[PDB]
Amino acid sequence: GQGFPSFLRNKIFIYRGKEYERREDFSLRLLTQFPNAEKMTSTTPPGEDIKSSPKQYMQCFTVKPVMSLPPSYKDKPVPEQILNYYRANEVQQFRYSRPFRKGEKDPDNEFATMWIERTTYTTAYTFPGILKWFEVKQISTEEISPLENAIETMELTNERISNCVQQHAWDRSLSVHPLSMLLSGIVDPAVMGGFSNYEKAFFTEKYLQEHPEDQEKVELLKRLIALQMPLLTEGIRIHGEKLTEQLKPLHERLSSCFRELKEKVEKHYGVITL
Amino acid sequence: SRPILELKEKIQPEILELIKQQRLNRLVEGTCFRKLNARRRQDKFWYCRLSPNHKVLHYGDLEESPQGEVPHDSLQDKLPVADIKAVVTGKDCPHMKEKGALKQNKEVLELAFSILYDSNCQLNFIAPDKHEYCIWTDGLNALLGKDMMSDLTRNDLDTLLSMEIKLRLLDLENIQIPDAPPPIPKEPSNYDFVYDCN
Amino acid sequence: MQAIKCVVVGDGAVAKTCLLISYTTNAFPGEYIPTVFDNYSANVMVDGKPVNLGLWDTAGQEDYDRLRPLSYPQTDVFLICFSLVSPASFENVRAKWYPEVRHHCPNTPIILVGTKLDLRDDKDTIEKLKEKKLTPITYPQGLAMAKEIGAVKYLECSALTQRGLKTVFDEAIRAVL
């Protein structure tokens, strides 16, 4: 907009919100701060007219606090607490994901089009600071192939499963419900099968014609799921440690489908487990 | 008093806008409003404060505060001012038509006022008595920018307009106003002021 | 620190998963990213303390009626869902979903939830329903079905706007709380 004061007009800021402020809670709280409380909808790109137009325009959206590097920590088995502190505090980089359709809109499949224009944000000063907010200092975008999309989704999946594994491997009086959460969601991609989606999209020779030279990534995905599988094994056994009679039908289904996918990766996927 | 009355009511708006801004101040300072059927350990009193920007309303299930409004983040500090269809007053309130446990008795017939928003959410509120009930309705229609519905508002209109016109008729003492305006002397078309301007 | 179990069922023609994932992602409207797995979770503060939770994304196929009830036991609340603009969804819920659910877990607070609230008054969607002889069925009869079960609450929300969505989840959490 232009009604903004000089230092505010056409400026992008990042706000260290509260512990659990929803995007719209903070949005409304800012609406309190301002008259002409309106939001455009073109959330990602700017608005050229409103770069010069009056009638101050605003937009809010959570960004991803890009993980910092705790120096000298890069490999030691340091417990999570240190990192979860570093997870959000002492940060300067901020990425923002961007959906996009790039490919044919095949009905059963969304990943034939999935390309992500993650927008990275680098501010001047590292949160937390003397001010609960700061302008962006440099902004940049990204581009993510469905190959990559699968790669990093698979990754974060793996480390999340790890995370639950050790947190319940360290604490005993701990809810089994998250184990149910995870083991369910991973075991049956019931609403839609992500694994078969990988197979139809990438493992298919058709992808090897669309991206012949870019087959060096489907092998990466195979390695990813291969490394997953023993983690699934420890998840299964952790459940067995936390198994209850209610979970027993649950556990048997989990275990049965677990060795099902075991053999699927070993031979049906033909990927080599370690 | 025919020219007097014409001149009097014809310079109207200043008193009206003064009344309305006073209503605005009253809404902002607000008070602890009254809920519905606050019997079984329910806070009948709870403050509803308007923003100094007069665009959001600080209200919610606040406690039984006899001091009145406490300045803080009420249970909901937003009431969407830009989209309020209306406030229903009297029988138009669906909560008044309730025939179950939320039966409002006929003694709150003139304390029934429900803010219309979301096209399905209503705020069936109760006023402690008539004058402030009309005051809040007046404040809302002031946000709505239409006429007022406080008898006291018409009282103020007449009394202050009378005061102002009365304090103007001092120059015209011992003088009469021709009901037909005095004839305009022909202004010579030349503007070559023999004497200098200013 | 505590967690809450929460199930969501419904036909696959309404894509409630989109709504759930959009909420948990805190994402912009129309900007969510579809994952490969189900049964999402989040940690939420509603009052006093933040609380963990997880949302069993249960596929609505008739056949998975063998596996879905196994998830039912010891779920703090369940969320029955539908499409406000699908009369067939209404038929399924009043006829299949609601009956068998109330059968399975007769002792748990329940909230009914609308969907496609924006599409409820979508004139083009309405005229398509009329020319297809379907009804853009509105609130009061949804309220009627809520009374029919006496659900602790009924709400209508939308994904493209997330209106009431936060309220939907807050009511869901404070159903226990």
- Secondary structure (DSSP) of A182-236: HHHHHH---SS-HHHHHIIIIISHHHHHHSSGGGTTHHHHHHHHHHHHHHHHHHH
Instruction: Measure the CA angle with vertex A258, ends A252 and A261; round to 5°.
Output: 145
Spatial distance between the Cα atoms of B25 and B163, rounded to a whole number of angstroms: 23
- What's the rounded Cα separation, in Å, for the pair C29 and A39? 12
Chain A residues with CB inside 8 Å of B56's CB? Answer: 31-32
Report the phi/psi class of residue A154: left, alpha or beta, with left for phi > 0 and alpha for psi in -120 to 50: alpha
- The answer to whether A200 and C50 are in contact (CB under 8 A) is no
Among all residues of chain B, which has the CA nearest to that of A38?
B82
The set of residues, in sequence order, having a beta carbon less than 8 Å from that of C160 and lying 6+ positions away, is C29, C30, C118
Q: How far apart are CA C4 and CA C1, in angstroms?
A: 11
DSSP secondary structure string, A103-156? S---TT-STTSB-B--EEEEEEEEES-SSSEEEEEEEE---B-HHHHHHHHHHH
DSSP tag of C59:
-
β-pair partners for B58 = B49
* Chain CA centroid to CA B158, Å: 15
How far CA A222 is from CA of A219, B56, B152, in Å, comes to 5, 55, 80
Which of B107, B132, B169, B120 shows the shortest CA–CA distance to B27?
A: B132
- Torsion, Cα A12 A13 A17 A22, to 10 degrees, reads -10
Cα separation, C74 vs B18, in Å, equals 62
Distance of CA A147 to the CA centre of its chain: 15
Mutate one of A22, A58, A117, A161 to test the C interface: name it (highest C CB count within 10 A): A22
The letter for the amino acid at A21 is E
Angstrom distances, CA of residue C44 to CA of B47, B162, C20: 28, 61, 14
What is residue B103's DSSP assignment? -
Tell me B184's DSSP state: P
Q: In this structure, are residues C111 and C79 in contact, taking their beta carbons and an 8 Å threshold?
A: yes
Cβ pair C67:A253 closer than 8 A = yes
The C-alpha R_g of chain B, in whole angstroms, comes to 24
The answer to whether the CB atoms of A185 and C45 lie below 8 A apart is no
For residue A95, give every residue at least 6 positions away whose Cβ sits within 8 Å of its Cβ, in sequence order, or none. Answer: A63, A64, A66, A118, A119, A120, A121, A142
**H or E element, residue B87:** strand B87-89
Q: What whole-number distance in Å separates Cα of residue C97 and Cα of residue B159?
A: 67
Among the partner residues C31, C38, C166, nearest to A24 by beta-carbon distance: C166
The amino acid sitting at C55 is L
Q: Among all chains, which residue has been given the structure tokens 């998830």? A: C71
Nearest by Cα to A220 from A197, A207, A232, A203: A203
Structure tokens at C144: 């009627």
Strand order in the sheet with C5-8: C40-47, C49-57, C5-8, C77-81, C110-113, C153-155
Structure tokens, A147: 């190959």
CA atoms within 13 A on the CB side of B179: 3
- Interchain pair B77, A35: CB under 8 A: no
Please provide the DSSP assignment of A80-107 as one string.
HHHHHHHHHSSEEEEEE----B-S---T
Residues B101 and B37: their CA atoms lie apart, in Å, by 8
- Strand-strand pairing, C110-113 and C77-81: parallel
Partners of A31 on chain B (C-beta within 8 Å) are 56, 78
Structure tokens at B174: 């011992």
Question: In chain A, which residue's Cα lies nearest the Cα of B51?
Answer: A32
A254: closest chain C residue by CA: C67
The answer to whether A116 faces chain C, any CB pair under 8 Å, is yes
Q: Which residue(s) pair with C78 in the sheet?
A: C7, C110
Length of chain A: 274
CA dist A174 and A181 (Å) reads: 14
Q: What contacts A71, CB < 8 A, 6 or more positions away?
A: none
C39-48 in b/e form (b: 16+ CB < 10 A) is bbbbebebee
If we measure between CA atoms, which residue out of A113, A138, A141 comes closest to residue A123? A138
Alpha-carbon distance A32 to nearest alpha carbon in chain B (angstroms): 7
- According to DSSP, residue B172 is labeled T
At C77, give phi and psi (nearest 5°): -135, 160
Q: How far apart are CA C172 and CA C4, in angstroms?
A: 10
Neighbours, chain B (3 or more CB pairs < 8 A): A
DSSP bridge pairs for B169: none
SS3 B98: coil
Is the distance from CB of A150 to CB of C33 less than 8 angstroms? Answer: no
What is the number of alpha carbons within 13 Å of residue C79 lying toward its C-beta?
A: 30
String of DSSP letters for B118-159: TTTEEEEEB-SSHHHHHHHHHHHHHHHTS----HHHHHHHHH
Minimal Cα distance from B52: which residue of A?
A: A32
Nearest CA among A49, A22, A10 for reference residue A136: A10
Contact between C88 and C12 (Cβ < 8 Å): no
Q: What does the alpha-carbon distance between residue B12 and residue B23 come to, in Å, rounded to a whole number?
A: 17
**CA gap B131, C102 in Å, rounded:** 51
Distance between CA atoms of residues C118 and A69, nearest Å: 44
Residue C59 CB coordination number (10 Å) = 19
Rounded to whole angstroms, how far apart are CA atoms B48 and B29? 9
A239, A245, A250, A251: CA torsion to nearest 10 = 40
Query: What is the rounded CA–CA span in Å between residue A216 and residue A198?
Result: 14
Rg (C-alpha) for chain A, rounded Å, is 23
CB contact under 8 A, B77 and A31: no
Cα–Cα distance measured from residue A23 to residue A62, given in angstroms and rounded to the nearest whole number: 6
- B81 interface with A at CB cutoff 8 Å: no
Residue B77, chain A, CB below 8 Å: the answer is yes
CB contact A107 to B (< 8 Å):
no
Alpha carbons B118 and B111: distance in angstroms, whole number: 22
Q: Which of A32, A33, A36 to mutate to test the interface with B (most CBs of B within 10 A)?
A: A32
Asked if residues A39 and A57 have their Cβ atoms less than 8 Å apart, the reply is yes
CB atoms within 10 A of CB C120: 20
**Burial (Cβ within 10 Å: 0-12, 13-18, ≥19) of residue A273:** middle
The tokens for B149 are: 């519905």
Q: Does B55 sit within 8 Å of A35, measured CB to CB?
A: yes
> What is the C-alpha separation between C29 and C32, in angstroms, rounded?
7
- How is chain B split into domains, by residue range? 1-29+147-198, 30-146
Residue to mutate among B50, B54, B56, with most A CBs inside 10 A, is B56
Contacts of A234 by beta carbon, 8 Å cutoff, 6+ apart = A165
Nearest Cβ partner of A28 from B51, B53, B78? B78
As a whole number of angstroms, the distance between CA B20 and CA C53 comes to 49
C42 DSSP β-pair partners: C53
Kindly list the domain boundaries of chain C, sorted by start residue.
1-177
Q: What is the 3-state secondary structure (H, E, C) of A29-76?
A: HHHHHCCCCCECCCCCCCCHHHHHCCCCCECCCCCEECCCCCCCCCCC
Query: In the A/C pair of chains, how many CB contacts fall below 8 A?
Result: 92
Structure tokens at A250: 């649950």
Chain B residues with CB-CB distance to A32 below 8 A: 51, 56, 77
CA nearest to A42 within chain C: C28
Axis-axis angle for helices A247-263, A177-187 (nearest 10): 40
Distances (CA, A) of A267 to A127, A262, A263, A270, A271: 49, 9, 6, 4, 7
Would you call the peptide bond into A128 cis, given omega within 30 degrees of 0 as the criterion? yes
Q: Chain A interface, mutation test: which of B51, B76, B78, B81, most A Cβ atoms within 10 Å?
A: B78
Q: Please give the C-alpha separations between residue C124 and each of C121, C129, C130, C132, in angstroms, as whole numbers.
A: 9, 9, 10, 12
Contacts of B193 (CB under 8 A, 6+ apart): none
Strands B49-50 and B113-117: what pairing?
Answer: unpaired
The Cα–Cα gap between A130 and A144 comes to 35
C44 interfaces chain A, CB cutoff of 8 Å: yes
Rounded to whole angstroms, the Cα distance separating B159 from B166 reads: 10
